[PDB]
Ligand binder design. Sequence first.
Ligand SMILES: [Zn+2]
Ligand SMILES: [Zn+2]
Ligand SMILES: [Zn+2]
Ligand SMILES: [Zn+2]
Ligand SMILES: [Zn+2]
Ligand SMILES: [Zn+2]
Ligand SMILES: [Zn+2]
Ligand SMILES: [Zn+2]
Lengths: 323, 323, 323, 323
Amino acid sequence: MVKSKAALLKKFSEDVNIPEPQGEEVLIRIGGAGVCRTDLRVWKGVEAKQGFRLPIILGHENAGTIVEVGELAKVKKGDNVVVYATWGDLTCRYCREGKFNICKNQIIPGQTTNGGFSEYMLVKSSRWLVKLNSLSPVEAAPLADAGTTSMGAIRQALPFISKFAEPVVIVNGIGGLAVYTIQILKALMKNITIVGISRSKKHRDFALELGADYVSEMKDAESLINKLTDGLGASIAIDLVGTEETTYNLGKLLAQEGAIILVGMEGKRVSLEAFDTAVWNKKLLGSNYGSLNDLEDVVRLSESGKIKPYIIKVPLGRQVITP
Amino acid sequence: MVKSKAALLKKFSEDVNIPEPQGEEVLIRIGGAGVCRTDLRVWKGVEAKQGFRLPIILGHENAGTIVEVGELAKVKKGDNVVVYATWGDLTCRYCREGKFNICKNQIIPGQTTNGGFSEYMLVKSSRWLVKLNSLSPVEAAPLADAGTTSMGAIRQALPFISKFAEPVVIVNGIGGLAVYTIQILKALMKNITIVGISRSKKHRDFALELGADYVSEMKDAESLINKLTDGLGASIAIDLVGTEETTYNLGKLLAQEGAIILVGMEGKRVSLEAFDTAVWNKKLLGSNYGSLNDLEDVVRLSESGKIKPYIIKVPLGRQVITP
Amino acid sequence: MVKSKAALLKKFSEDVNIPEPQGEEVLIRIGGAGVCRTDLRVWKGVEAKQGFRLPIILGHENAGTIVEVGELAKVKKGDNVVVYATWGDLTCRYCREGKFNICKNQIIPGQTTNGGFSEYMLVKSSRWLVKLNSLSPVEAAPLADAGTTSMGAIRQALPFISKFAEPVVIVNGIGGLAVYTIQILKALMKNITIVGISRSKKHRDFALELGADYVSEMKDAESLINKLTDGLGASIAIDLVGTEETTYNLGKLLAQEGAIILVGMEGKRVSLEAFDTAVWNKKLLGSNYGSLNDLEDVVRLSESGKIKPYIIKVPLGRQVITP
Amino acid sequence: MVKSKAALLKKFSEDVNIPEPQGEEVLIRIGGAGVCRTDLRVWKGVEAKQGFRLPIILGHENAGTIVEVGELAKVKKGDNVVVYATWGDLTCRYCREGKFNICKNQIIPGQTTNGGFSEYMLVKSSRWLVKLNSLSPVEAAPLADAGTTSMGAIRQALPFISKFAEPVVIVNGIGGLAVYTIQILKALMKNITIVGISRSKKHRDFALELGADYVSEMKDAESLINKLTDGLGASIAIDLVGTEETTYNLGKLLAQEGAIILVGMEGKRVSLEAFDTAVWNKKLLGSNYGSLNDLEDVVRLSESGKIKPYIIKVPLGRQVITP
Ligand SMILES: [Zn+2]
Ligand SMILES: [Zn+2]
Ligand SMILES: [Zn+2]
Ligand SMILES: [Zn+2]
Ligand SMILES: [Zn+2]
Ligand SMILES: [Zn+2]
Ligand SMILES: [Zn+2]
Ligand SMILES: [Zn+2]
């Protein structure tokens, strides 16, 4: 058993011990553990997935170096890896399609078991590790959540975007997720027009820096999108905020058949106008995290120079805890 | 110009004149004009699509006999036909995919121009007419809306149903639409379990008569569906009511990745729990009417004996105005 | 190490030893090992997948009883199970979507490692075992290949079938696979018309017994299908034979946009008329085996009485070796 | 009736008369009529679609200026337009989904009725005309076939390409179609690797000029693609040639689940290895022309500067007849 310095969540406002790996398990030395809006919802005790219990080391957005292995892990000590965060039960019909992210008995380091705000972290199986060929664990850490979630959301969006020669895609909420959502869209789709929506001028400026073509307050978005699309509307809106008001307003900006990809869940509920949605065949599609292939893909885009990290190192854009 | 007895909507609480057909236009003698919840929303002035104006003959659910033709109509006088209700502008990118039903400049007899609560009715083009080979116009009339809408909704549902060997499909709201939605599902899908939800015991009994396997109040639906699916949840919920509360409650009954098909729009808004929807990749898909192929298909199912009409004839289930 | 009586393939025209399970491995007592056309191609040395080597116990279509377990198997001794046959490497992008069946480094009992024509058989992981709640291992054995392959093929077909109200589906080649393909189609799709094609009158009779609506020689199929579909053509052809001539002829029977699902590979090549295929947007879609969910699904259909086995017990339709 | 100078096909090795438009018909002054490999197959009497008869003015790839209109045409004299080439019967289930291109009773100017190698040309309906806002009819003419066909083929490919972060796409045959296929792919997809295959060094050089990343002889393609994809294979192969040998060889280069999009039909048949296709779930998808939206889209890409024409003007890359 290995000693490790961590940050513990004990009540909703130092040095721990970590078991040695057996079977397929792997022990890693954390290089980076990203800080999510999800950590703050757990921190504030407004979100608790199955198996959650106190205390717990938070941090579900993790990269580092392999230091010890069980006899069945089949991985190389010294390799840098990013940790896929949603460890499915492997048995259910979702896991049997690689949809570990929507397994209802998933184990999540930092959300339901000990995570990355710690020197060392146990990983249940090497099957959850994606190799970093050249990207640093610190820069790679956000890919384990913000990156993968952005990719999974974009993949749901693609058929809606590909229907048009010059589609407008709305990205609502410019924070950690928008870093990856905007850059991934521009990396893949050469003829897309991205519109960034936020209430903060600072955030709108940042969306432009990330690669948004236009930015807007929500109230001004219709007049802009009308002009950009000759009244057609947006192909997709990726909602990184997810409140009653964001989805309602986004839905109305969509062209017929268009979709909101719901990633954010800051509100208790989401809402849509019944007439606009039913009459024009509009859609809302929930998106939680992504597949192992999605994580592989964002690592590859990053290592090939197509995505740039915007990270803020924080000693124990996106913030990253190092160690 | 032809004289005709109709029922006029003049304020929101006899004998008219009808132009002779030119070009591709066709004049029909109405055999049946169905009565919709949509007529009551227009009647009460809570719904007005583009081009709507007073006065107007309502009735958008129409069948009858061809009596006169323009020189370009290319149809046979004496043929019985059902009238496709959503006459697209033919020019837009939705009409160019046969998606006339979601054209934003559609002309609709009974909703935006004169309809079927009348002895005779002008049809803008023969392209909107589907032949009845043996079904009577009176029995066929509901296919022009309830039938086609049910088919379009089911077609959106199919890939979600086909994922499972023994899927539960929820049908919420047991009225005119449920007549066709339940029967069409059972006509196509041999191994489906249909659960009918309504607050009325009478309506629940009627759902069983139509072919539902089980019926339930919404509050009891979770415990039933849990038992029927070993906790998996429903594959699809077809919402024929469409209020803030119906969608919210239906969403929770779905298995991961499952969808609500939103057909009804009795409420101003619909709503969903943000966590349940985002975390489990659930969906809401708007459905308005269907394609000409959908209308052809429900006519064929009806003529082959696979759907039975539940109609109530009303001299000027589903009510039908005759003439 | 456990003694076991098997049948060995030593050259291309008794009693062996079997290792005890470790880690996730499971040892089963074979109840049924089905005999495939694939075994005969391996037997004749005309087919050898990666890792194949002599000698080898054939038989990739297996069910039986759990008798011993490794410490990590997490399964119950005494349970009856069917063995999923395509053991993926778990690492590749296909396995990460549960597509173990198309993993290029798959291990297959009876095709690349020791299989089921043997009293006992080692299974690499309990993850490859699907529980039989009530079906006997002998009756269940064909589900491990013929059944699952039929299901996977049908699942590719579904969107092509669901486009129509009264689709004709062709099933070409009436042998072991047709047992499941025909019955599964009829179990799922209530309004389908199945046309069975074979050169053998005996086989055509058997297709009718299995649930085909019509049967035909290939040369007579066009005139029949024309009559059944008013010249539209077939929605799908499932080719269980797969020669140069079968695909060529089947392609021509399809409606525009229709597909051949290629399951059989009795020929070296398949072929299609370039004009008919390109001009009418026809398709050919390869299908190898299925997912773990596909196996689960055919087990459930069988246990619910919706599929009937046609098995021939053979002491060491479909033949089954017992033990 | 209007006099016009044309080129007539009379046997398989000057001045005509053209009727005045009625109803929805439009008369155009040809600005450009492109020359296709299809014209040469008709010219040589190796291809004749329904309704074809001698004599006939060839040329199905047409743009020009509106000069006269029937009373129902609803278009503006003086407007420049490109002519959609596949005039569906409007009645069938394919036309009811805007799939005019696969209507079996289509009328095609230059293939089944008089076409564009002529000063003036009658267009059956204004519904077949797409407006040119700024592109010249001469430069626009190839969009009416090569352009639209490329777009339709790419649209079938997209879901296969979008599955990967860095997909290789093969384009086989570098002629008129490749001009648009290569440029459209690069216009839409920023992270694609295009491999051009041809037997001609000249054509391979031209593929590089058009935007291919690599070029190869077919025999050398496997070793290249293996290196480019770490042995995965190509996501898609667009076959602009379409012979027994091209499809066979292309199929083998594909990753599991990958597809050939069959556009070319230079051979009588196409062929595929049965084992490679069935075992790895590979596909062949026929593609004929595209939708009206596809034509709109390539016009827009061209007018926005994202596609460049490679045209050769020929007084009566791609050749264009002017007038
Ligand atoms: Zn997070
Ligand atoms: Zn699971
Ligand atoms: Zn209605
Ligand atoms: Zn329209
Ligand atoms: Zn087999
Ligand atoms: Zn694999
Ligand atoms: Zn051409
Ligand atoms: Zn047609």
